Amino acid sequence: SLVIISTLDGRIAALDPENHGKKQWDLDVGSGSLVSSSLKMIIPSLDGALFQWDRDRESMETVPFTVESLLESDDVVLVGGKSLTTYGLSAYSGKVRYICSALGCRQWDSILLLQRTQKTVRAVGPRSGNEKWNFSVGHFELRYIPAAIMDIVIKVSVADWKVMAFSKKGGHLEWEYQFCTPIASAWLLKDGKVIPISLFDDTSEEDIVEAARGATENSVYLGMYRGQLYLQSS
Amino acid sequence: SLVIISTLDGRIAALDPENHGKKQWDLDVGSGSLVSSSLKMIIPSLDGALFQWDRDRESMETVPFTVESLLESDDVVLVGGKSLTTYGLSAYSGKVRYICSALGCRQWDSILLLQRTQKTVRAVGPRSGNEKWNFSVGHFELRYIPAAIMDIVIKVSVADWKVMAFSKKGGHLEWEYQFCTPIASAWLLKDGKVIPISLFDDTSEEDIVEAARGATENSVYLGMYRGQLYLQSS
Amino acid sequence: SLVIISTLDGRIAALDPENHGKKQWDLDVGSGSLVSSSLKMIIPSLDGALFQWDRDRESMETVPFTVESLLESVVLVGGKSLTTYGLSAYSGKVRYICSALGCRQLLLQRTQKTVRAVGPRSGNEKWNFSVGHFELRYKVSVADWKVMEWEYQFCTPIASAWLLKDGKVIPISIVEAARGATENSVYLGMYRGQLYLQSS
Amino acid sequence: SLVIISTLDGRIAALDPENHGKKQWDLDVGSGSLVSSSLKMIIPSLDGALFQWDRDRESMETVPFTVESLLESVVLVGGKSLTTYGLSAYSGKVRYICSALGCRQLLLQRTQKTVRAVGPRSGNEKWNFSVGHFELRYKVSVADWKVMEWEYQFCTPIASAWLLKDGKVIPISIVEAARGATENSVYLGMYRGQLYLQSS
Ligand SMILES: [W+6]
Ligand SMILES: [W+6]
Ligand SMILES: [W+6]
Ligand SMILES: [W+6]
């Protein structure tokens, strides 16, 4: 019945789409932020990809490595790993029912499944652990087991950190929520089914080339979060 | 000593960078064009990737398939394949010394290696070969076996189908060549070493975000060649 | 009900399991045999994977390359083919044969992989590998070359074997029992002229 | 010169090949054994690949999944670890141990893969798989559990075996000869408690 938003700080918000977008539960689990880096320059994507931004040539080129691909592996040594943990949430209210991971489950006793994937790669230089650098990305995947809702459409502005509800009868604003950190994901949970909300939407010969070029720029976001440059794309 | 340009018609030009960019050899081998398609809509990239352009949402999303990945494989059947043939050219003059492929070499008797890769996938619907659709991409890779030249820099304009030489002493135009078809690749062959020429170049806080966003749009080209929409990227 | 048999020379024979073993049809498609080679002896497979042998060492060990992953870059050429030959179930009669260039007007899907090293300056071949296997959707003794009331013999060694029935398609072939199963689970024969592995 | 031996319980012993076989050091790193499991019997490997067995069928056949490719999506959890434990060559003495969270202040690189199925509603584990192998850069009888003048016995079964010498690191272990090599080229033992495959 509600809306789930995954921000870059690694947190999960949940809004009741009627009337207010009034927050119904926040879930902060310490897990870090959704993207990290120590150390032209390399820009991590939310997926796990890295991109090389040459500042001298004004170019962005794909490095042929991933955080995972680096783990497959001169002078340095690669460490790190990929993890999958699932949080059994009680939608709604709250809450954590369990935290399931590789070494064990952590249960509380008393319908929303929330999986965090985390990929870390740390480059260390022998004969020591002085860490020459690292990259670490993460994201949430969501499942419920018991478009947009009728009367109201839900959109998401990446560059504005805003979720918004518009009436299909007027297009006008019904409610709005501003977040204090960049948005990485957004799901609309409705009548049992989980529905992913796109971050990239605009709606109301050599013509269609511009239309398709207009489309290709519309489908990439480059943001900054607490000093970390990252890259969202489709 | 010269410059090699691979166009979308599947041809290979070669220019003497001094003084003129005067063409020295054209190589037309029937092999088709560098990208083809029969049949929202799907846009092939030069690599082999496909992209889905939703015209209603003004969005470009990655399909999780490649021309090769489709071959790995309901109602339809996939056929096609990937081929690697090498043309032993005589740089310079001309020419073909041999054409080496899977089933055999085709020799002439009397220093430039030119490999064409070709990826085709055809979707056919049983019980017949009426071909529900197809995609076919190709590209050239170049090797010589016996930046830019001194005094002169070589650049390439994708959207203008132009190769250009500029003096390092003034930045001014030394010579220029206009092609009649979109450019897919460009190599600068100099003193034994083969040097790939980038298709994307411009040269002369929240600041660097725009600088890096300016960079990320600079590194993608969406063109059209004889009706076929394609996509160049880094 | 029909019995389709993929031989290791590239041709496809069909038998009637109606207490005959008689051949109703047999198809040769000029793509070559399922295994080819050239001039530390190494052995390929149906896949095609690659394996390295020496008679002094006790072992057979994987080479970190495949025919395919060699195409992804001495000069290497070749490629991969996916061709489906449409048959009418009984007595063959190819209806459509669609390859990469286009379709010519029970379907046998023929995969072929080929890599050859050639002299950069000359073009002269240094060595090669060609691997293929059949797939076609609508008890055999691999020791010798027979399918078994009734039996049937080849020329050439067997590669794959399916049994059609009613429309459905069926292919067929303490820790001691476990290890014993692993033993008789890989096959290494000869063709011609060359060692080949049939995996599992 | 040193002899480093990776046992199948996760610990690493070193022997002096100076006509002793004596243990100079031995390292246990709490990451678990190299193979774990849970409750059509299937068998994993060091990689870790997965294989399916039934005592009625003559065979051992690949399942189209790995511990890793199951992580890439009953509910599945777990992950993959890459940890390198820096040792001083003789007598161990771990200098640095860098995992994904950070480095704590001859290097053993420990890979671990883990997948477990859990009940969606409950969280209760349904089954799991854990696979690990050691790698560390700066004649053994796998039949029994010994390395051979002098010999040495384990508890537990052997997984990998290297021989250090002068600085360099060396690990060691008609068509009849070919097929014979393929035979004694895979190992299927028991631990504990579970069948495991050591590939090649
Ligand atoms: W480095
Ligand atoms: W379709
Ligand atoms: W060689
Ligand atoms: W099950």
Author numbering:
A (entry chain B), B (entry chain B): 104 to 142, 152 to 185, 190 to 226, 235 to 270, 303 to 360, 371 to 400
C (entry chain A), D (entry chain A): 104 to 142, 152 to 185, 192 to 223, 236 to 268, 311 to 320, 330 to 354, 374 to 400
Paper's wording?
The unfolded protein response is an important cell signaling system that detects the accumulation of misfolded proteins within the endoplasmic reticulum (ER) and carries out a cellular response that attempts to rectify the imbalance. There are three sensor/transducer proteins: Ire1, PERK, and Atf6, that are critical for initiating mammalian UPR cell signaling and give rise to three separate branches of the response. All three proteins have a luminal sensor/transducer domain that in concert with BiP is vital for sensing ER stress, an ER transmembrane region, and a cytosolic domain that propagates the UPR signal (Bertolotti et al, 2000; Schröder & Kaufman, 2005; Ron & Walter, 2007; Zhang & Kaufman, 2008). In an attempt to shed new light upon the mechanism of UPR activation and to rationalize the differences between Ire1 luminal domain structures, we determined the crystal structures of PERK luminal domains in two different states: one state is the previously characterized dimer arrangement as seen with Ire1, and the other state is a novel tetramer arrangement.
An optimized human PERK luminal domain construct encompassing residues 105–403 was expressed and purified with cleavable N-terminal His-tag in E. coli. To overcome this, we used a tungsten-derivatized multi-anomalous dispersion (MAD) dataset which yielded a good quality electron density map, from which we were able to build the structure of human PERK luminal domain, and subsequently used this as a molecular replacement model for the mouse PERK luminal domain. The human PERK luminal domain structure forms a ring-type tetramer architecture. The individual monomers are arranged along a twofold rotation axis forming two sets of dimers A–B and C–D. Each dimer presents an inward-facing concave surface that intimately locks together at both ends to create a space in the center of the ring tetramer (Fig1A and B). There are substantial contacts between monomers within the tetramer interface, with the key feature being a helix swapped between monomers; such secondary structure swap motifs are indicative of a transient interface (Ali et al, 2006; Czabotar et al, 2013; Tan et al, 2014). The salient feature of the tetramer interface is the α2 helix being swapped between opposing monomers that results in a total of 2,500 Å of solvent-accessible surface being buried, making this interface more substantial than the dimerization interface. The swapped α2 helix resides in a cleft created by β5–β7 and β18–β19 as part of the tetramer subdomain. The interface comprises predominantly hydrophobic interactions with a number of hydrogen bonds that also contribute to the interface between monomers. The electrostatic potential of α2 helix is positive while that of the cleft is negative. However, analysis of human PERK luminal domain protein by analytical ultra centrifugation (AUC) revealed a significant tetramer species that exists in equilibrium with dimer in solution, with a dimer to tetramer ratio of 3:2 (Fig5A).
